[PDB]
Structures are given as C-alpha cells and as structure tokens.
C-alpha cells in the first residue's frame, strides 16, 4: 500500500477547491 | 608558437587556463595566473620526479616503480608535511 506524494498534492489542491 | 612555448614550460598553460575556466572558481581569470600556476606545477612535479629517480638510482634499478615514489615521499620531510594525510596504493 504505497502512498504517492503527487496524490497528496492533488488531494490538497482538490480539498482546497471544494473540501467535500 | 602557442602560449605553452611562449611561457617556456612544457606543462600546458592553455589547459590550466581552460580547467580554471570550467571550474567556475571566479567569473574572470587573468593571463599571468595560469602561467604562474603551471610554473608551480612544473617545479613540484620536476622535484618529486628528481627525488624519485634518485631513489631508483639508489638501489640500482633502471626502472622507476611506485615504491621509489613512496621512498621519495617518506625520505623527504617536507614532502611528508605536504603529503602526510594521503595514502598511495596499487602496489
């Protein structure tokens, strides 16, 4: 179960956009 | 007559100037400084060559070996001051 850093940047920017 | 014969030293002043340029030690380098440095290299290399050749002459060996270089470094005290930290090998 590898966690990608680019996925964390994408999730950071997306939760900055709408935060769900 | 290039710069090497103009300086009178068979060590290359042009190659010293070029490798000073590629190192980016400073953005400007002089003309007399590579001549000076290759004369220093001439003196040091010629002196350690003469001591190593003399050490080859001591044991009547016609051929110089790295053991003669090691004898030249150990026997001279100032070369031990200059080259005490470094070890040399492949022999």
């Amino acid at each position: 179960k590898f966690f990608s850093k680019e996925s964390f940047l994408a999730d950071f920017d997306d939760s900055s956009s709408n935060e769900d | 007559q290039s710069r090497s014969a103009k300086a009178g030293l068979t060590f290359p002043v042009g190659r010293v100037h070029r490798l000073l340029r590629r190192g980016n030690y400073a953005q400007r380098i002089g003309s007399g400084a590579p001549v000076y440095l290759t004369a220093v290299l001439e003196y040091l290399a010629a002196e350690i060559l003469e001591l190593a050749g003399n050490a080859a002459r001591d044991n009547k060996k016609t051929r110089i070996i790295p053991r003669h270089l090691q004898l030249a470094i150990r026997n001279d005290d100032e070369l031990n001051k200059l080259l005490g930290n470094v070890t040399i090998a492949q022999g």
Partner: protein
Amino acid sequence: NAADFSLTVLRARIALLATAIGGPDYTSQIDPPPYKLGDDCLACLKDLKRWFKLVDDQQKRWDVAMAVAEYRILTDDLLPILIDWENKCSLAAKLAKNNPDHEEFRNKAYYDKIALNCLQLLVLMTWPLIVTEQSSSNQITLYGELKKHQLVYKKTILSMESGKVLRAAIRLALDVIKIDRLSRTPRDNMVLKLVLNFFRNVIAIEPGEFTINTKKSMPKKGITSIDTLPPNVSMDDISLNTVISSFHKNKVFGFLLTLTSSLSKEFDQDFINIPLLEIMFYFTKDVNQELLFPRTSA
C-alpha cells in the same frame, strides 16, 4: 536592584517588539478584522530569534520565553500571520489552478520568509522543557509556569479555527517537496525537519508535574491539589482526541503517511528519520492497543 530592573526592561522591550510585529487593522472595516503586517516586521521576527538565541541559549535563562508568553506573541501575532498566509496561498492556488498566471502575490518571497520565521519561532518556543540536574536556578524556578504557558500554546494551536497553522506548516513542507530530489538544497530538507519537529511539539506537549519542597515537614492539611493547569485550559483541550480531530481535519495524517511511505525513494532519510519516529512515539506513548478494538453499546 539589578535583577528586577533587568527583568522590567526586558519585559518592556518584549512588549515593544510585540507591538511592533503587527496589528489587527482596525482602520479597515471588515466584520472579522484581517491581520495586517507592520512596517519593517521581518526584522522584528529576526529580533525575536536573536533574543531567543542570545539570552535563552548561552546565558541559561528562560525569562524571554515568559516575557513573550505574557504578551501573547504566539496567540496574537504568529498564528494570525501564518493563517493569513495559508488562506491567501490557498485562494491563490485555487485561482491559479483554474487560470494560470492570473492574480499573483505581490511579494510572495517576503510572505514565505516571514511564514518560515514564524514557524521557526513556533518550533523554538514549543520545544519540550527538560530540567535535569546542574541546570540554572532560573530554569528550575520557571519550569512549571513555562509548562503552563506551553499548555496555553498547545490549546491555542489546536483550537484556532481547528488548527489552520497545521495546514500552513504542511504548505511550507510541500514548498520543499515540489522541488526535485536532486535540486533540493540541505536547507530545504532542514525546513522539512522543522515542519516534522513542529508536529512533534504539537503532539508532545503534556501537562506538567507538581513538585513540592520536602525540607520542611508536611503539615496536617497536606496536599490539597496537584492540578497544574492554566485558567482557560482544560484537560479536554490537551487530550489526544482534539489532536486526532485537528490532524484529520487538516490532513496532517496524509502528510505523515506520504512522507513515511516514500522515505527512501523520495526524501533524504537521514534528515527526517528521527523526528518521524518521535512523532509516532508521541502518538503511541499513551494509547493502549486492547482498548482500540471495542470487540446502546456504551
């Protein structure tokens, strides 16, 4: 009368510096007052760092820490600066993601530098207080009150709009992370160590211990309390539940996971191998594993 005169001139100078860092901008009329940086304010951050270096470190005193703490530099100056930088950078990142090269910062390097200096003061001021033997009497006298001020620091960090300073700290970390591994200077990895150390300070702050003098005999009244808490700070604010809530809301957990999982392939592991273990230990020092599995039920 040299000691109290030196103490009151030191407290006066920290008060002047704390007024000189910034203001809440009461001139502008917004229903929440936006925090405005003072004129020549980065020099004030360097002066707080210089004061914490020259007095607190070599001279073996802790007067500067309480002089800062009673004038609320962390509560009222550093946290609004970092939160304003976080909110402005988040809005700018949104507007640049939708349309690049529109609505930039005017002085982004200045804001990044003052944000980095504010994070440096957060790490330097919330450092774990250890008092071993042969230490100065100033530290021994001041240890309990400075632990209480650090408790106020932890409550204010975790409670200020659910800890946006944690998002500011991870943004300062992903400023480093966006650079390639070969292009990263060791100062950038030291900034990563600064962020991981800040998270270990946020987790690691615990209530202090009650120390008594046993030279005199214990009277008939005895110990009436061992409470070591500040007035506004309760045991719920300090406890790990608020830490987990503020860390999950601000995505600290994903940050720690994505630095732990790619520790060897992406980061220089010798910089951040020890603060990461310290963070894991400071979670798991007070958690029993049998109670984490529960197997109307209440």
